Structure formats: C-alpha cells, structure tokens
Design a protein around this ligand. Structure first.
Ligand SMILES: [Zn+2]
Ligand SMILES: [Zn+2]
Lengths: 113, 43, 147, 138, 119, 98, 56, 56
C-alpha cells in the first residue's frame, strides 16, 4: 500500500537533486561559457537496485566543479534517454576519467604474466 | 699501538672492510685479460 | 576456460576477479572510531557534505569511519556502492551504511548500529576485515592468467 | 663463575591477527602460569598504568605502540598494589614464594640479591619494546 | 590516537558518555576523575602502514660508515654529500625506496618519482 | 679458520667503572620520556643504564682497546638506527684480526 | 658481507660470479661459491636418507 | 680463442647494465609489480633473469 508512496517519493527526490544540480550545471556553463522541469522529466527517465542506480546517478552527475569538466563536457555532449541508463565508470572528474585508466594499464599487464 | 684490532662477529656489524691494503685502497686516474675480474676501492 | 571461448582474453578477465578472494582488509587503509552521537549530523568535516548526499535520498552514537585506497579498490575493480551493499547485506538490519562515492576523493564508508557500545563497536571491526569476503571464492588466492 | 643458573625467561604476545586481544603475558620460572606484564611491573613497585606504560615506550608520541599495551592494562586492572600483585602467584604463603622468585628465578643477570627492583623491571620494559616492535614491523 | 591518564592516580582513560549533553568524556574508573573529549577519536587502525619509513634517523646517521654517501642535490641546502637507507619498515611488501638524510642539515628526501613523503 | 682465535672472556667492572666516569645515567634513576634519544648501554647483554652523548663516549672506549687498557678481545658496538651499546666482555667470542 | 655497504642489492653483492674457474675467482666470488655449494651437500645427506625410507 | 674471452666480459657487462636499469626503476617506485608478486620480489626475479640469460 505504501509502495508507490516510497516510489514517487524517490522519482521526485531525484528531481530535487537534479533541481539544485541543473542550477549548478547552468551557472558553470554561464560564469565560464525551468532547470527543475529539465529535472522531473529526467528523474522520471530512470523511474533495491533503484536506490543504488539513483545513489550512482547522484554523485556521478553532480560531479563538480573540476569533476564538472567531465560532467560539463557531458551536459554539452550527452543525449536525452540515449545516455540515461549508462552507469559509466570514467563518468567522474576530467582527471578521474584517466587515472582510472592509468591503474588499469598495469592491471592487465601484471595479470597476463 | 693501534695497528690491528680483534673483531668479534657482533662487532663486525658497524665495521667496513677493504679486501687488500692496496688492491682496494687509493684512487683511479694496460688491463690484464686472464687476470681475475674483482670489484673496487670505491669506499 | 568454458568449452566455446578458448582464446577469449576477456573471458578470463571476468572469471579472474570473480574467483580471486578479495577482503575488506585488501581495500582498506585505516578503520577509525569517532564519537558522533547524532544520526543525521556528522561532526567530521572530511565527511560533512558526503552525508547530506546519501541521506536525503534511533541510530547509534558510535561512528565507524574507514578510509579506502583508490588503486587497491580499482584493482579488483570496485565501487563504493559494491562495498556498501556488500556490508549492508552482511550485518543486514542491526547496522546501517552511508558512504562517499567513487567521484568523492575521501574514500569513506561510515557505519553505525541500532547501555555499553565503546567495546561493542570496537568488536565489529575485527570480523569486518577478516571475514567480510567482498569478491570471489574464499581460500582461492593469487588468480594468475595463462595462455 | 657460579653453577650456570639456566633460568630462561619468556615474554609472550597473546592474540593473533584478527584475535584483537594483544594481551602481553610472561612465563615465570616457578609460578606455573603466563603472568600478564601488568602484574609483574606492579610486583616490583611500578603500580600506576602510565608509569608501567613509560617503561616500554621510550617515547610517548607512539600511539601505534601504546594501543597494544592498552588492552594489557585492562588484563591486570583488577590487581593493583604490590600486596595484590605478589598474591596472584602459585597470602602469607605466596607472599614469600613470589618475593624470593623475583630476586632468584626472575632475571638473575643484573641482580640476584634484592634492591634492584628498578634495574630488572626497566629491562622487562625493553623486552616488551622490541617485542611489540616486531609486531609493528619496523 | 591521543589518550591521557588520570591527573590524580595516573590510570588508563576509559570513555563514558554524557547522554544528557551528548558529549564524550574520558574518565578514570580507578577513581572518579573525568576529562572531556578533546579529540572525539577513540581509535585509529592503519592497515596500510606509512609510519616506519624513517626509523632510526639520528643526526649521527653519517657516523655509521656502513651506510653509503649520496650525490643527489638536496632541495633546501643542495648538499651532494648526504647518506641513504632503504625503508626501515621491515614489511616484506615494501618497495626498495631510498631516503637521503643530509649531514650538512639532516633534511631527509625521497628518491621517489611516484610516492612523495614530505613528513 | 687459521687467522681466527676464540676469547676466554675478561672483566666487566673496568668498563663499569669507565662508563660511569664518562656519563652513565643510572638505570635506577633514568627518565624514559625525559631522556628519549639516550643511547641504551648494555654490558654482556646486562642493562646497567643510559648515556646522553654516544659518539663521544664511543670514541673514548675504542682508544683504550687500541692502547691496551680495555682488554683487546672486548667488543663494543654502537647502533645508530636503534641507539644502543652492547659492550661485550663475553666468554667464548670468535675474533678475527683486521 | 662486512666488506660491503649497507643496502647493496648489486649483481656481485647478492651472489653473482663473472669469472670462470680458469681466470680464478675473487675472494668474494669464492665465498659466495661456498654457501651455494654448502646447500648441495646438506640436501644430499637429507634426501638420500628420506628416499631410503621411501624405498622401504 | 682470444677475442671470444673478451666478448664474454661484454655479455656480463651488458646484463650488469640491465641490472642497474631495474635498480634505478625500483628506487623511484616505477616498477610494474606482476600478479602474485611483491615489489621487493619483482626486481630480484627479473634481475636474476638477465644475469642468468647472459650467464648461459
Ligand atoms: Zn584515578
Ligand atoms: Zn639539506
């Protein structure tokens, strides 16, 4: 009975997360080259593993401000639902997208023997 | 007089020895082939 | 390797970390205990905002914060969410988890529980590292690849 | 040049690596039990914990060293003055047993006589120093 | 970690929680003395040990002829007359990394181009 | 070995006498935290007390051995990376000349 | 060896011989040859006896 | 034969250079430690390889 009372409470809490985020992604692409409507139409675009995929959508997208050189180069690169259920590894910071590949280049080298 | 010392094996832990009083002793400034290939005076 | 995929390089690349025994001991640098009497607010500044994220979207006065190594984690290829849900389903409903994600540089997993708890929380970290298996079958250690 | 009193002394560090209990104990020649170093120091005059703790740590700033002595205090926390420390051995009876064994069977090298409670218990502290140090890997 | 003792009897400090003011207090059971939680940190683990790299560092480190002298230029005094030793952390895992202790000023520095150790 | 010869041990007191006369802090009245760096001094593995300046006393002992005074079989060693002096006068040590 | 510098993982240091038996080994190149040969006398006595029980 | 005996101390010398390579690599922690191998072990295992590759 309180199922969709927790479900809509999340699909709208994620809209609230994307409300302050599409305001921080806007101000970064303005102070250096509404948003809540662009949020509830994208927080419903995913809407357990749901509190996990959301937990992941939270810190990975709200990646700012040096992490918003990879999250700003995604706000000005990625498509609508055609970038949505991506859950990318390198999705983090401009520097974190590469250091993750720097400890991976020896992770296969040390492994193969 | 102080021209020689008797060294116990635990005392050896802070001593530094040269193999020969000349072979490993001065400083560099022809070369014998069949002769042994030893290290150096470095220290 | 499984009948079909004989020369498949990537097949062994999955089975390897899926068979190799990973511990919380492997991925952890230091496990600390603080005194945070409030469930919501965290007196830790190195965690001050980390909470406000995985919170908004009754509970123990004794905090169990532990730092992780980014290379040692992204060695068996890991997520803080993986580690987080792993421990979550280990203790289950008696201990609740919060963490900083892979985006956040301060690699932390904060933990609490539900008279006397200084010794009882200090007791937990013992079983936590040694017994919490994270990846692969136990005993089966050094998984090395051969062509 | 007197017989060769082969009274070999053990100082053990109980509890594994997972078994947190880093209770430091020691095998007493004659008292058939591994007495925790806390009862020992207290049976030589060093009664307060922090004085006991200064005999081991030749510093003060090493938390890594003091967190291991930390449960060892709790080990003997119940016993305190020399009168109690000397009783947990083997009253009126073990009062003598312990007293003489400390002079005789315990660390006969340095002093066997009496009055070197200090010299012998300072040595015990050094024995645990290099003991915790090997577990610390330095 | 940082722990003190009783300012009356010198005994291990035992945590006791004032649940009325929700403050930690480190007290001596051996008496009734209590002090407050300066550092609300109770315990630090440190599975990955990074305090054991510069053990046995005396100014008199140059008075062990056994240790060989360096040629690297020091960052604050530029001395190419120093001395060096491999990590005094007896952990088998530890990489053979060098620490150059000066004799003209005793300003220790890493041979490292991976792990910078400024302490 | 041909060149090697084993000790029959000597007297520890002329060194007990010496160490104290050159600055041996009593073990009985040594402050472990006050004097941290104090280089620990042992005679045949027996701890007698500490000293404040090691390289100084260490230079003094070495002379007596090469003078004839501290018996020439006696072996004294200063550890820097630990701050210690396990002076040996022990019976049965194997010594080789250099 | 006490003839070496503290922390020497060098070729000759950890026991390598560059000379042939002809040329004649150095004092060091000879001592390192003693210890490695030492093992090859112990294991002889050991396994020749254990093997004896293994035949039985 | 004369120059072959000279060439031998060239083979041991080139591998002695292949020794300092790993020696310098290990000092600045640039060594890519293999799977199921300690960093201390990694250098030793490889330093032995070139010394014995050239010994042969
Ligand atoms: Zn008290
Ligand atoms: Zn300098």
């Amino acid at each position: 009975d309180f199922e969709s009372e927790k479900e809509h409470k999340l699909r709208y809490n994620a809209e609230k997360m994307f409300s302050t985020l599409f305001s921080k992604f806007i101000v970064p692409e303005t102070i250096e080259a509404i948003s809540q409507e662009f949020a509830h139409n994208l927080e419903e675009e995913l809407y357990k593993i749901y509190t996990e995929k959301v937990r992941s959508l939270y810190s990975n997208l709200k990646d700012k401000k040096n992490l918003e050189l990879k999250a700003h180069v995604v706000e000005g690169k990625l498509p609508l639902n055609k970038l949505v259920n991506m859950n990318a590894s390198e999705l983090a910071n401009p520097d974190l997208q590469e250091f993750k590949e720097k400890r991976d280049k020896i992770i296969l080298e040390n492994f193969i023997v | 007089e102080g021209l020689v010392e008797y060294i116990d094996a635990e005392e050896e832990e802070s001593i530094l020895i040269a193999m020969q009083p000349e072979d490993l002793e001065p400083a560099e400034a022809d070369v014998d082939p069949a002769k042994r290939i030893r290290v150096s005076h470095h220290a | 390797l499984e009948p079909g995929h004989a020369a498949d390089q990537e097949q062994a690349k999955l089975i390897r970390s899926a068979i190799e025994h990973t511990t919380l001991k492997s991925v952890t640098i230091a496990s600390e205990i603080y005194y945070d009497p409030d469930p919501r607010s965290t007196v830790i500044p190195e965690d001050e905002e980390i909470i406000q994220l995985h919170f908004s979207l009754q509970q123990s006065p004794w905090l169990l914060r532990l730092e992780l190594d980014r290379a040692a984690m992204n060695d068996k290829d890991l997520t803080m969410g993986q580690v987080g849900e792993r421990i979550k389903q280990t203790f289950k409903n008696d201990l609740f988890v919060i963490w900083s994600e892979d985006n956040d540089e301060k690699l932390i997993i904060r933990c609490r529980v539900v008279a006397e708890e200084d010794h009882m929380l200090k007791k937990i970290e013992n079983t936590m590292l040694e017994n919490i298996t994270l990846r692969g079958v136990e005993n089966i250690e050094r998984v090395v690849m051969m062509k | 040049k007197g017989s060769r009193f082969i009274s070999t002394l053990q100082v053990k560090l109980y509890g594994r690596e997972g078994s947190s209990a880093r209770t430091i104990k020691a095998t007493l020649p004659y008292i058939k039990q591994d007495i925790p170093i806390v009862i020992i120091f207290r049976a030589l005059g060093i009664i307060p914990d922090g004085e006991i703790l200064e005999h081991i740590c030749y510093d003060v700033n090493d938390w890594q060293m003091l967190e291991m002595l930390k449960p060892c205090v709790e080990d003997g926390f119940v016993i305190q003055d020399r009168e109690t420390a000397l009783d947990f051995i083997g009253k009126e009876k073990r009062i003598q047993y312990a007293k003489d064994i400390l002079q005789k069977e315990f660390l006969p090298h340095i002093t066997q006589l009496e009055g070197f409670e200090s010299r012998k218990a300072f040595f015990l502290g050094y024995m645990i120093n290099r003991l915790l140090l090997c577990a610390l890997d330095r | 970690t940082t722990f003190r003792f009783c300012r009356d009897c010198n005994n291990m400090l035992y945590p006791r929680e004032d649940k009325e003011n929700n403050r930690l207090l480190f007290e001596c059971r051996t008496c009734s003395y209590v002090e407050e939680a300066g550092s609300p940190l109770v315990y630090r683990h440190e599975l990955i040990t990074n305090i054991g790299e510069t053990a046995g560092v005396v100014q008199d480190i140059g008075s062990d002829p056994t240790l060989p002298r360096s040629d690297r230029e020091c960052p604050k005094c530029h001395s190419r007359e120093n001395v060096f030793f491999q990590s005094q952390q007896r952990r088998k895992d530890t990489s053979m990394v060098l620490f150059f202790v000066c004799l003209s000023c005793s300003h220790i520095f890493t041979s490292d181009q991976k792990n910078k150790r400024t302490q | 070995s041909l060149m090697s010869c084993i000790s029959v041990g000597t007297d520890p007191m002329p060194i007990i006498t010496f160490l104290s006369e050159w600055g041996m802090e009593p073990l009985e009245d040594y402050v472990p935290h006050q004097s941290p760096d104090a280089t620990r001094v042992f005679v045949n593995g027996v701890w007698h007390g500490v000293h404040r300046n090691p390289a100084r006393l260490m230079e003094t002992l070495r002379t007596l051995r090469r003078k004839g005074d501290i018996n020439p079989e006696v072996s004294m060693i200063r550890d820097i990376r630990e701050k210690e002096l396990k002076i040996f006068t022990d019976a049965g040590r194997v010594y080789r000349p250099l | 060896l006490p003839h070496f510098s503290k922390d020497d993982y060098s070729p000759e240091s950890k026991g390598f011989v560059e000379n042939s038996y002809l040329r004649g080994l150095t004092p060091q190149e000879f001592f390192f040859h003693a210890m490695g040969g030492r093992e090859g006398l112990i294991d002889t006595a050991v396994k020749t006896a254990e093997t004896g029980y293994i035949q039985r | 034969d004369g120059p072959t005996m000279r060439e031998i101390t060239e083979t041991i010398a080139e591998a002695k250079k292949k020794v300092l390579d790993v020696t310098k690599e290990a000092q600045a922690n640039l060594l890519t430690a293999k799977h199921g191998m300690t960093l201390r072990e990694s250098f030793e295992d490889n330093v032995v390889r070139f010394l014995n590759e050239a010994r042969d």
